[PDB]
Amino acid sequence: SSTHPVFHMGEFSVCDSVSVWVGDKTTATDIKGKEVTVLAEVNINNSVFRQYFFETKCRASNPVESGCRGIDSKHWNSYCTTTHTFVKALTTDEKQAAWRFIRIDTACVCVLSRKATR
């Protein structure tokens, strides 16, 4: 059936990623390597904001049984790597809410390798 305009003449990617705005994140690692308790809402003094985090995870580490879709999996070995970044969030290491930079999954990238070790 030709009743499919490729979703939206595109949109599909080499790998399937899922981006979720997580607020129920209770723990995250700061850039300094500190595992801290993350707050769903930022309580500064008299202001509460729902911050949330856009965590883009890999739905599949290998959309196809060889690597990524479209990729010549004979010369190129592929896998979906979830990239971690450090985001400015109000987090508490114990009983002190402070603005830190915590690692969240920002994207899911398909990496290519020539599958040739040296």
Add this chain to the structure above:
Amino acid sequence: SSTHPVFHMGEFSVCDSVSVWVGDKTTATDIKGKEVTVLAEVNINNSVFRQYFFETKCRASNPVESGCRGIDSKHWNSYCTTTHTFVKALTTDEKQAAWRFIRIDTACVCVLSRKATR
């Protein structure tokens, strides 16, 4: 010459992306569609933090003259789309610094299309 272990037996992606931590971002659009002046440092009351933004842009919209590297550009048409996300930043719409959600470039994804219009 075989003096190349594929950089790090991988790392290379279908598309070339550049992730920069920008602090000199003076303007950004809030999720509500408000063009606001972005501050390099967040001045709340008596606390100044250097926030910065991780903007991952596309170094090339088409790494190869057909689509993306490895992709069968005969059945799949490809191009690198820079994904925009809204990040919680202290921004001023004029003379009021407030925590808003501004669109930054978070990733550069290679999208695939069957190059077949319906």
